[PDB]
Amino acid sequence: KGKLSLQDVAELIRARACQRVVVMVGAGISTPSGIPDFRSPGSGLYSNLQQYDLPYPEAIFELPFFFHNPKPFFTLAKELYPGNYKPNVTHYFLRLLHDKGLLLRLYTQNIDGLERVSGIPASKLVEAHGTFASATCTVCQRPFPGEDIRADVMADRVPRCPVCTGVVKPDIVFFGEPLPQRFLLHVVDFPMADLLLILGTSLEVEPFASLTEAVRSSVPRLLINRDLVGPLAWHPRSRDVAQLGDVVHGVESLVELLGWTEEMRDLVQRET
Amino acid sequence: KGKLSLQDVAELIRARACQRVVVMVGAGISTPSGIPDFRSPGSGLYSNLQQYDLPYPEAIFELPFFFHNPKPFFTLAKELYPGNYKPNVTHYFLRLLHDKGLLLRLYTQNIDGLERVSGIPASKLVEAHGTFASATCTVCQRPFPGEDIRADVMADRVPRCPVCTGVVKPDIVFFGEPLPQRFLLHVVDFPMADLLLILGTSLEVEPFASLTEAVRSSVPRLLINRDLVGPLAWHPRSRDVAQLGDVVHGVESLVELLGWTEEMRDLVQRET
Amino acid sequence: KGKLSLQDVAELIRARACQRVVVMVGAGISTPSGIPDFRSPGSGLYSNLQQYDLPYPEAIFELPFFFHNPKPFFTLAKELYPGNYKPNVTHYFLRLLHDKGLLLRLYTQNIDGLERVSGIPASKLVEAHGTFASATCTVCQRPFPGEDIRADVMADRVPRCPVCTGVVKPDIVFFGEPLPQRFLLHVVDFPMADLLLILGTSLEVEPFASLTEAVRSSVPRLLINRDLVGPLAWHPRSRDVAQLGDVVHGVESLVELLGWTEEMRDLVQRET
Amino acid sequence: GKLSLQDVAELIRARACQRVVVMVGAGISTPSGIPDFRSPGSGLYSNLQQYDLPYPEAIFELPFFFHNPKPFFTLAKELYPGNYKPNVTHYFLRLLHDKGLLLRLYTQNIDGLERVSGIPASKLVEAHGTFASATCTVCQRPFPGEDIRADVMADRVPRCPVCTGVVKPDIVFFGEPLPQRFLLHVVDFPMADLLLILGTSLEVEPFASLTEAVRSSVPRLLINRDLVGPLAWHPRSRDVAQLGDVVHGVESLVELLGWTEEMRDLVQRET
Ligand SMILES: COC(=O)c1c(N)n(Cc2ccc(F)cc2)c2nc3ccccc3nc12
Ligand SMILES: COC(=O)c1c(N)n(Cc2ccc(F)cc2)c2nc3ccccc3nc12
Ligand SMILES: COC(=O)c1c(N)n(Cc2ccc(F)cc2)c2nc3ccccc3nc12
Ligand SMILES: COC(=O)c1c(N)n(Cc2ccc(F)cc2)c2nc3ccccc3nc12
Ligand SMILES: [Mg+2]
Ligand SMILES: [Mg+2]
Ligand SMILES: [Mg+2]
Ligand SMILES: [Zn+2]
Ligand SMILES: [Zn+2]
Ligand SMILES: [Zn+2]
Ligand SMILES: [Zn+2]
């Protein structure tokens, strides 16, 4: 019936009737910046991690495993460390969401840091999987210096804090660590949201997929990702719209439906 | 003075101060149903997994060992398939937590499926080590309901894919496979818990065992198990309680202090 | 018919058919002399190390932890340096095979030093986890007799070179150090041995646990432990003999089944 | 009449020594370019420390190998057959076998160069195993070491019967049952009339212990950068010690044997 297309969605934001946007982003926004992804067979990182004959492929994120075997995690680290990559039209669009005062929160499962590198502030972010921007000693459990354990990460060396080696670990959240207290914000963010935008994520690894259903039944869910997936696939609602297809072309056709094409082109030029 | 024992944890639940309870369970709640447990000797499943000389007991969850000889795995699978065994009091106790609206989520290392038989619904469950409810071809990767396979598995026959002849395996987690998609619901579940209950597990198979340290620091952690194990034995917290002894006996004393002895008897009778 | 019982074994030693007994012992032969154990739930030295924050009980043998806080490790040694505890029937029973000329070699995971104290010379021993006999500094690597650094451990100091003025340390094997030089004497011992005797050991830490299979398949394999463990639980041979029960009584029966009871009583008296 | 290198060379020339037992170590492979993981600041040593292993020899530990096989295959890559050639120490041992004087050559190297030098397998105890043979850890199917050599830039897992899993070169691991061929030592050493200890530290047993197994009348010649093991701690009256660079030492002894020109044509023809 009176259903929603991307046209309908753009003029909700133009008519500023949607002004509290909660955005969920996964790897479908960072693959077009050159980011390998460790869960894609045929990635240079997948093959080199596949080589580690690990138990589960995600043990690289497990603290007790890390204490006896740190080098696989650090194989992923230099593939994804900050300073080698650039944000794209996806990251910078979300910066425009913020600037125009429309962003409630950006939930990311990426760890490249290009949400913050694009100018979105820390207070608008939930970096669900942590950051490479700070690091801690595993022994003397204090440090911080972010890039600092860098160069070690370039040079295939396991970084060490000046007083107990200590395999100083980038602040990627590991199984067995206390989890981010900021993740508790989902409790109040997902009710408040007058709009759920799902960008370039397979809604495959929890809690991300469950969260798409925390939003009020009146709230629309717009999916810009190759294929409908997760609850949008299985439990769709009346206001669910999806631009199945390439994320980048996806965000440009939505950006051209808002009229931000120029602001963008300007911002990607200014920023870069 | 007012520190924490078995009475106090019952007092909190009856008073509904605890209403978001998170539970972890392992093998010790499956042994009282007569389940063999393949790891301790003197089990018939030992003398029967001796017809196949192996290096590890674990080697039965290793894809390359499966890729000659599925027979050691499939004699574990014949002994454990849904049918033979019946949920015991501890199961039904958990089912009563969900009946009375106290179960946030049940995390299990078991693969017998007696949490599902006891009537706890699937949405309440994270099956850490997979399930026999479903099957996928090792070559095709085509999915299969598990009863397509129970004819063959209940015949000392190796089930083959009808589309490509590849050997089909139950969706029991194997070394090298990505961890269950639902294991990450703990990011949301455990900081939301106001009580953590641990029943019948050694807390030695991670990432499962590290989940003990993901409830907030004030939240009590009740252990019902023979001995102190895992993070509860090296990082004990103030509000932890260790009811040490036979697993069934521990729960019976908790039900009595809860005052559920008749409601349990009844439910258990009607369910068997 | 002629399958092997603790009786049978004691006849081959009396008949001098087994004249090359290699022997493996672990913390289970040490315990009955009062040894506290660093990894047992609720003991003297266990709560000591637990007083500090360690993520592992095994971090005391971890070298970057020794460069942060060494006072854990040393207040273990302060409760294991020789003199404090006295050898028992197990130490002296292995003292008597040597005396009677039957011992090829004693292999031991123990560090309390009691095998030496019992009258077994250094060349009969292979000390897998090191010894409190010699010392060494942790910068220059200068050698020090154990007394040298024994003065200071009992003086609660942290012992330091005149060179580095840096913390010296007992030659207890630490993670990242190379395994004792004597460990590879097994390449000649075990194939030369006609009896393998395994005492009070969980057989859980490699490369110690692997020695069990280094004997020729002809060689009787005998375990005095509380329960059937390690490679004798999963890979038993035609000639393995399991005396399950307390280690001290298992020796005391065999000591009677060899009829050295009078010898043991007088060897012990004289040594005390 | 107390022994020096000229006299040992003389005992060989007269065939007064015809049953030579030889023990060799990483010092006869380092002149070929083979790194050596034990030697601090080598190539291997630094990359292996990137794996924070529980002890450095863990790379030959069999249950460690079923978890991270990488640190071992990291050693295998810089040691694998087909990157190096036998140097002059090998051909000198090959000249000793061709002259009918070698009783047995005992080696702790796994680089295979003794065999490439032409020494018969029957004169060889490879006390650490070999890379000429590889075994699937799951099905025990044998492979030529050259089957997996291509992968020896990451990690090998062939197909076979009970396989699809990690194929392990036959380096002897703690956990694998130890070489039956090594029992030859019980008779070779009591019967040697000369012991050549070439280019080994006697750091890793049983070799250090085996220097004592020759009869007290049998000279022990060490050609090695330094005095090591029971020769330093328990010297006998008939030990000679050519300390300094193994290749110079061997070339020196070859001069005293009158063999410099036969080694010429040999090394030349073999390379
Ligand atoms: C970019 O991926 C990451 O950094 C991940 C990461 N850090 N954990 C562990 C983790 C996340 C959140 C938490 F609260 C505690 C522990 C992950 N688990 C995964 C499980 C399945 C599939 C993909 C996964 N990816 C990650
Ligand atoms: C009935 O137990 C099961 O179903 C098991 C199962 N599926 N795996 C394999 C596995 C678990 C977690 C992972 F991340 C990857 C692969 C197991 N490993 C074990 C290891 C030691 C002791 C018991 C074990 N039990 C199981
Ligand atoms: C009192 O026992 C000891 O002296 C130990 C000792 N010295 N390490 C360190 C070690 C490092 C490398 C290596 F190859 C052998 C040993 C230990 N690890 C243990 C780990 C788990 C459980 C008990 C352990 N016990 C010891
Ligand atoms: C190139 O060195 C190797 O290949 C080694 C190797 N294969 N083992 C293990 C081993 C040898 C013989 C046996 F009968 C059973 C197991 C080693 N252990 C060492 C211990 C200390 C220092 C160096 C060592 N090196 C090796
Ligand atoms: Mg730091
Ligand atoms: Mg001093
Ligand atoms: Mg093959
Ligand atoms: Zn530190
Ligand atoms: Zn198939
Ligand atoms: Zn010093
Ligand atoms: Zn294979």
Author numbering:
A (entry chain D), B (entry chain A), C (entry chain C): 120 to 391
D (entry chain B): 121 to 391
How is this structure described in the published paper?
Sirtuin 3 (SIRT3), a pivotal mitochondrial deacetylase, plays a critical role in restoring mitochondrial function, particularly through the activation of autophagy. The human SIRT3 protein contains a mitochondrial targeting sequence (MTS), an unstructured region and a conserved enzymatic core, which includes an NAD+ binding domain and a metal-binding motif. Sirtuins share a similar deacylation mechanism, with residue H248 being essential for their catalytic activity. SIRT3 regulates mitochondrial function by deacetylating, and thereby activating, numerous mitochondrial proteins involved in energy metabolism, oxidative stress responses, and cellular respiration.
Here, we report the identification of SKLB-11A, a SIRT3 activator with submicromolar affinity and high efficacy. In an effort to uncover the molecular interplay between SKLB-11A and SIRT3, we analyzed the structure of the SIRT3-SKLB-11A complex using X-ray crystallography at a resolution of 2.49 Å. The structural data revealed that the pyrrole ring of SKLB-11A inserts deeply into the cleft between two structural domains, where it forms a π-π stacking interaction with His248, a critical residue essential for deacetylase activity and conserved across the SIRT family (SIRT1–7). Furthermore, SKLB-11A formed a hydrogen bond with Val292 and tightly positioned between Phe180 and His248. Intriguingly, a significant conformational shift was observed in the side chain of Leu298, which deviated substantially from its orientation in previously reported SIRT3 structures. These findings suggest that SKLB-11A may modulate SIRT3 allosterically through an entirely novel mechanism. To further evaluate the functional consequences of side-chain reorientation, we substituted Leu298 with glycine. Biochemical analysis further revealed a diminished binding affinity between SKLB-11A and the L298G mutant, with the dissociation constant increasing from 33.15 μM for the wild-type protein to 167.4 μM for the mutant. Collectively, these findings highlight the essential role of the Leu298 side chain in stabilizing the interaction between SKLB-11A and SIRT3 and preserving the enzyme’s deacetylase activity.
